[PDB]
Amino acid sequence: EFSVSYDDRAIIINGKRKILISGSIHYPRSTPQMWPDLIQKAKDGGLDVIETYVFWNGHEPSPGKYNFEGRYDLVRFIKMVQRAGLYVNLRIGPYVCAEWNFGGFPVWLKYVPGMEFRTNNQPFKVAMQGFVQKIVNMMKSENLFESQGGPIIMAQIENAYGPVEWEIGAPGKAYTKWAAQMAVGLKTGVPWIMCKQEDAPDPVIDTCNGFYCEGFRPNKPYKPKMWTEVWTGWYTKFGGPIPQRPAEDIAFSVARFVQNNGSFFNYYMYHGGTNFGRTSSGLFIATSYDYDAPLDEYGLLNEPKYGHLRDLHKAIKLSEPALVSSYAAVTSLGSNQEAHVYRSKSGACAAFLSNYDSRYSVKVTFQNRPYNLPPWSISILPDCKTAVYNTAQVNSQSSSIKMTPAGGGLSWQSYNEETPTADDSDTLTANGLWEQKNVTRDSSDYLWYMTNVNIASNEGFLKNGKDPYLTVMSAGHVLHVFVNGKLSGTVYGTLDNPKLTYSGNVKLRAGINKISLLSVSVGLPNVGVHYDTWNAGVLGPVTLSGLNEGSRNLAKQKWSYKVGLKGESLSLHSLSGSSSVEWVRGSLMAQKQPLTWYKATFNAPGGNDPLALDMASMGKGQIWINGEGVGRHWPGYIAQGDCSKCSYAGTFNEKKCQTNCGQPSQRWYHVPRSWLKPSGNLLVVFEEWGGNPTGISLVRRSRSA
Ligand SMILES: *[C@@H]1O[C@H](CO)[C@@H](O[C@@H]2O[C@H](CO)[C@@H](O)[C@H](O)[C@H]2NC(C)=O)[C@H](O)[C@H]1NC(C)=O
Numbered sequence: 119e120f121s122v123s124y125d126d127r128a129i130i131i132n133g134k135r136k137i138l139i140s141g142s143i144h145y146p147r148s149t150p151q152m153w154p155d156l157i158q159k160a161k162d163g164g165l166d167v168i169e170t171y172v173f174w175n176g177h178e179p180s181p182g183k184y185n186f187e188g189r190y191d192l193v194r195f196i197k198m199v200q201r202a203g204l205y206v207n208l209r210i211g212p213y214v215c216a217e218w219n220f221g222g223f224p225v226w227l228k229y230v231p232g233m234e235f236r237t238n239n240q241p242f243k244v245a246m247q248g249f250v251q252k253i254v255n256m257m258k259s260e261n262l263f264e265s266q267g268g269p270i271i272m273a274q275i276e277n278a279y280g281p282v283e284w285e286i287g288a289p290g291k292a293y294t295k296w297a298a299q300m301a302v303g304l305k306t307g308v309p310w311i312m313c314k315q316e317d318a319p320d321p322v323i324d325t326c327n328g329f330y331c332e333g334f335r336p337n338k339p340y341k342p343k344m345w346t347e348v349w350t351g352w353y354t355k356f357g358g359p360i361p362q363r364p365a366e367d368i369a370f371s372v373a374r375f376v377q378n379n380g381s382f383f384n385y386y387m388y389h390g391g392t393n394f395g396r397t398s399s400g401l402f403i404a405t406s407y408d409y410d411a412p413l414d415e416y417g418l419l420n421e422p423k424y425g426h427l428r429d430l431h432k433a434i435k436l437s438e439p440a441l442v443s444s445y446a447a448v449t450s451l452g453s454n455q456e457a458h459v460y461r462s463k464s465g466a467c468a469a470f471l472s473n474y475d476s477r478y479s480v481k482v483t484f485q486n487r488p489y490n491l492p493p494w495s496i497s498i499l500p501d502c503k504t505a506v507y508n509t510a511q512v513n514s515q516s517s518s519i520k521m522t523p524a525g526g527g528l529s530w531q532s533y534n535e536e537t538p539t540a541d542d543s544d545t546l547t548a549n550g551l552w553e554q555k556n557v558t559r560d561s562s563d564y565l566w567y568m569t570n571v572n573i574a575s576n577e578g579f580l581k582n583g584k585d586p587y588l589t590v591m592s593a594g595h596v597l598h599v600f601v602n603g604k605l606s607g608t609v610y611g612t613l614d615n616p617k618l619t620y621s622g623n624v625k626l627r628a629g630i631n632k633i634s635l636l637s638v639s640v641g642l643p644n645v646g647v648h649y650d651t652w653n654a655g656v657l658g659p660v661t662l663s664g665l666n667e668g669s670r671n672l673a674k675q676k677w678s679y680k681v682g683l684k685g686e687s688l689s690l691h692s693l694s695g696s697s698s699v700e701w702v703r704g705s706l707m708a709q710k711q712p713l714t715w716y717k718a719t720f721n722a723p724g725g726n727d728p729l730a731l732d733m734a735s736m737g738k739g740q741i742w743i744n745g746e747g748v749g750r751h752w753p754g755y756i757a758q759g760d761c762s763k764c765s766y767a768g769t770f771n772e773k774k775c776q777t778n779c780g781q782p783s784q785r786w787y788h789v790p791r792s793w794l795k796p797s798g799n800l801l802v803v804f805e806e807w808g809g810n811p812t813g814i815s816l817v818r819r820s821r822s823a
């Protein structure tokens with residue numbers, strides 16, 4: 119009764135070939151209350167398919183122990199897409215990349231004996247197989263594959279493994295063949311895909327990802343041409359600018375794919391949303407995952423992009439009957455101009471008129487009619503006669519963002535975190551430096567590295583006014599050097615160069631001195647060959663120079679360790695644990711002091727406009743609302759980059775249209791309205807660096823013209 123197949127031309131759904139317009143919405147990057155609205159906006163946006171990864175590390179935070187509640191109710195999500203009458207592309211992975219913590223892998227999986235990620239490895243294959251089968255059976259049980267009458271029209275195994283293969287060699291090739299075969303073996307009833315996988319074995323369709331995919335061809339003539347990730351922008355990193363991609367360029371890129379036998383394209387992202395909590399964003403990925411998506415982080419329409427693409431879709435639909443019953447024939451129109459014509463025997467005809475010149479308009483003559491093609495544009499003629507649309511002629515009104523403060527400054531109470539000093543009587547120690555992930559298992563961003571340094575009272579520097587020199591090399595990502603109780607410096611890295619060295623004169627005194635290093639990870643790496651093996655934390659070298667002896671290798675002494683903060687162990691973020699301790703009030707409020715907790719109670723504003731926290735007054739830390747993790751803040755990290763003004767025309771790259779340079783990387787932090795009660799809301803902020811909580815203001819988001 120229902121089926122999904124495919125031929126050289128398209129995916130065939132229930133016996134009908136389709137030109138499928140898709141967009142990505144990641145279920146855990148918004149709330150269940152937001153989903154129907156997001157999905158409805160997608161539908162009105164002209165999307166046929168919603169595409170999502172599955173996030174293993176969210177769904178299995180402990181072997182055998184699963185989570186499918188709240189924003190992680192995968193089944194609830196898929197069912198809401200079905201209710202909107204849209205299809206689903208379930209990209210199961212379970213390596214997913216996605217700028218997501220560890221690429222989606224549960225951290226515990228690293229520490230399974232014999233384990234090795236994304237290669238021909240028995241522990242890996244068992245774990246991977248097990249979870250993929252769990253997800254497929256969960257879907258099948260509720261008849262959620264299209265074959266069974268459900269919305270899922272295809273699924274992805276792995277993610278962009280192709281590049282990784284080339285470096286890993288034969289074991290990669292064997293893993294690829296295994297992953298494809300095992301996926302197909304789960305008998306979903308619908309096609310399987312792998313992205314960036316030139317060697318995908320039948321019957322798996324290999325797809326394309328990027329800014330443009332118009333030249334791409336699947337690895338067999340009898341597979342449709344599909345573009346699984348049309349990048350709508352780029353991620354925002356802490357330390358980085360807000361990257362935009364011009365709607366006119368996207369529409370061009372899409373038109374250019376479709377005109378050339380493309381039959382499936384998917385905006386990555388259609389709704390980017392938010393990296394909530396502390397196990398969502400990957401290495402240095404900002405809380406905001408806006409991606410300059412057609413639906414902004416807050417779920418509002420990103421005009422004009424949203425509309426311009428709605429118009430594109432409308433035009434593709436007018437062309438569809440012709441598109442699906444012919445093949446693209448190319449007629450040269452000029453030096454740098456083409457016609458792509460889909461003429462069926464039924465008489466139905468659709469034409470695409472292109473101008474690849476990035477500088478000049480060209481007048482072109484097609485079937486006796488003149489067409490002005492703006493630079494870097496395509497005109498779509500659904501009947502081969504009248505241009506209903508052109509990729510550079512944007513007929514939606516633009517929109518910009520306003521954040522209107524609402525409520526005011528709340529009453530704050532503080533709670534100072536202690537700066538721990540090692541001693542003779544510690545619990546968890548070793549004669550060397552341990553890698554952070556290994557020690558913390560990612561239970562917290564924080565690991566204290568602690569040691570004693572003995573200074574003999576005859577030391578040269580003691581006789582004079584001098585201070586010895588301390589070098590702390592760390593694999594990243596932030597490091598606070600504490601000497602004899604006091605903060606001595608803070609060094610921090612970038613996505614590209616997460617490595618750190620602190621280098622400074624430290625005032626030591628005769629006898630036993632206390633060094634305490636606060637090592638902080640900001641998400642776990644999520645992309646790269648052997649990215650799981652990359653280190654975090656202070657693995658040194660660590661030297662103390664300017665002594666009677668030459669330098670002293672402090673990696674070679676006894677170290678002690680404290681995982682996490684005490685506020686974490688006390689859950690000062692939840693309502694129960696917060697009022698199980700006692701906080702400072704009034705005048706004696708923690709002002710610009712590191713490692714501080716702050717707490718306040720507020721009423722939800724009225725209105726139906728999305729809400730954020732203005733955290734400009736703050737440094738770096740985490741935010742909770744009624745015990746639910748809003749995410750990490752890091753307004754302290756100023757955006758660095760090249761932010762020239764750009765035009766839509768010409769080959770786009772992620773750095774072309776960057777904005778907000780010399781401003782806080784992310785100032786506003788999304789708060790889902792579904793997280794609020796009318797009154798008595800608990801706002802907890804751990805401040806890592808130092809900030810003034812008073813000026814923390816709640817804000818209301820609208821989009822003007
Ligand atoms: C769109 O698809 C068809 C095939 O699916 C392409 O036409 C084929 O071109 C190949 C290689 O150049 C020929 O050997 C085949 O004989 C053609 N097949 C058929 C069935 O006609 C066509 O070129 C593609 N369109 C564009 C724009 O390239």
Ligand SMILES: OC[C@H]1O[C@@H](OC[C@H]2O[C@@H](O)[C@H](O)[C@@H](O)[C@H]2O)[C@H](O)[C@@H](O)[C@H]1O
Binds near residue numbers: 214281282352386
């Ligand atoms: O899949 C979602 C994310 O993909 C990321 O890039 C993946 C791709 O990166 C290429 O540079 C590389 O050649 C290839 O091996 C893949 O790893 C995107 O950069 C990211 O924005 C998401 O789209």
Ligand SMILES: *[C@@H]1O[C@H](CO)[C@@H](O)[C@H](O)[C@H]1NC(C)=O
Binds near residue numbers: 557
């Ligand atoms: C990892 O942790 C264990 C102690 O729990 C230790 O034996 C091992 O050497 C550590 N290795 C590192 C930090 O790489």
